[PDB]
Design a protein around this motif. Structure first.
Motif, PDB file in Angstrom:
ATOM      1  N   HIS A  57      69.076 -38.125 -58.134  1.00  0.00           N
ATOM      2  CA  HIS A  57      69.077 -39.046 -59.285  1.00  0.00           C
ATOM      3  C   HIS A  57      68.025 -40.021 -58.847  1.00  0.00           C
ATOM      4  O   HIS A  57      67.445 -40.236 -57.922  1.00  0.00           O
ATOM      5  CB  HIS A  57      70.495 -39.730 -59.175  1.00  0.00           C
ATOM      6  N   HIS A  59      66.719 -44.384 -59.103  1.00  0.00           N
ATOM      7  CA  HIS A  59      66.912 -45.635 -59.194  1.00  0.00           C
ATOM      8  C   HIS A  59      65.441 -46.245 -59.300  1.00  0.00           C
ATOM      9  O   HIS A  59      64.633 -45.563 -59.137  1.00  0.00           O
ATOM     10  CB  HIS A  59      67.600 -46.210 -57.880  1.00  0.00           C
ATOM     11  N   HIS A 100      66.230 -40.493 -55.066  1.00  0.00           N
ATOM     12  CA  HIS A 100      66.871 -40.027 -53.677  1.00  0.00           C
ATOM     13  C   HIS A 100      67.986 -39.180 -54.016  1.00  0.00           C
ATOM     14  O   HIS A 100      68.425 -39.083 -55.271  1.00  0.00           O
ATOM     15  CB  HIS A 100      67.472 -41.469 -52.928  1.00  0.00           C
ATOM     16  N   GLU A 102      71.817 -38.601 -52.000  1.00  0.00           N
ATOM     17  CA  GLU A 102      72.780 -38.780 -50.921  1.00  0.00           C
ATOM     18  C   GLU A 102      74.032 -37.793 -50.920  1.00  0.00           C
ATOM     19  O   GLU A 102      74.573 -37.685 -51.854  1.00  0.00           O
ATOM     20  CB  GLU A 102      73.347 -40.287 -50.787  1.00  0.00           C
TER      21      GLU A 102
HETATM   22 NI    NI Z   1      71.778 -43.533 -55.519  1.00  0.00          NI
END
Ligand code: NI
Length: 229
Positions: A57, A59, A100, A102
């Motif tokens: 996704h 940011h 990024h 996670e």
């Molecule tokens: Ni994130």
């Protein structure tokens, strides 16, 4: 002049792989009161079942802080692939844009962390990703605008301490001019300016000349000294 957000009045969103509690409005959880506090815009308390994680996704224009409390988190940028174990923070100011993903590297272990979002003092700054191992007594300095005392940089006029207190200890926090403060109780039981708070509670102080914090027990807290309005 002190508001107590009790743990069980955070927005709850369980997703099967991700159980999560929101101190502020975030995703499919909206409340105009619980919007933000000064520059603190998001405090998310996430458990990510073994093997799961967020996919790729993007940011942009946000100083994001992760504080890992249990297990481990792998983090894959675009180009990083560094892990972060229980006890270490990891920031990432995004500015111009980043992407990024996670996830939880263990297949036997749950990952449990805090996700923190602080509105940066300007957009379009250069992506960056510091990640330090910042104990058992004392008030550590985790984030500051100049990276003093071994802290990490945060592109906002704010500091963040990881205060670890022993039972019946009690320190005062200077509190500046028109500044505002958020306590986020990590574990334990504390008492701030009269107001008890246990694990995962959060207190929001403003228009106050000082902060007495009384460790009703051994307990760790996160302190956000935050700028005015
Ligand atoms: Ni994130």
């Amino acid at each position: 002049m002190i508001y107590l957000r009790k743990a069980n009045e955070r927005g709850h969103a369980n997703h099967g792989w991700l159980d999560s509690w929101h101190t502020f409005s975030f995703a499919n959880y909206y409340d105009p009161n619980f919007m933000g506090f000064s520059a603190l815009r998001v405090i998310n308390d996430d458990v990510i079942e073994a093997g799961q994680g967020f996919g790729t996704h993007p940011h942009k224009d946000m100083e994001i802080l992760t504080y890992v409390l249990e297990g481990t988190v792998e983090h894959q940028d675009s180009g990083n692939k560094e892990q972060v174990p229980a006890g270490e923070f990891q920031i990432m100011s995004a500015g111009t844009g980043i992407r990024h993903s996670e996830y939880n590297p263990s297949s036997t272990e749950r990952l449990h962390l805090y996700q923190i979002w602080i509105m940066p003092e300007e957009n379009g700054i250069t992506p960056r990703y510091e990640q330090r191992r910042f104990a058992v007594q004392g008030k550590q300095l985790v984030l500051s605008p100049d990276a003093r005392d071994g802290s990490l940089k945060v592109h906002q006029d704010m500091e963040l301490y990881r205060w670890a207190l022993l039972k019946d200890e009690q320190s005062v926090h200077q509190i500046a001019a028109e500044r505002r403060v958020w306590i986020q109780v990590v574990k334990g039981n504390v008492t701030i300016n009269g107001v008890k708070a246990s694990t995962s509670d959060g207190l929001a102080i403003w228009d106050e000349q000082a902060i007495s914090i009384h460790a009703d027990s051994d307990s760790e807290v996160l302190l956000f000294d935050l700028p005015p309005v």
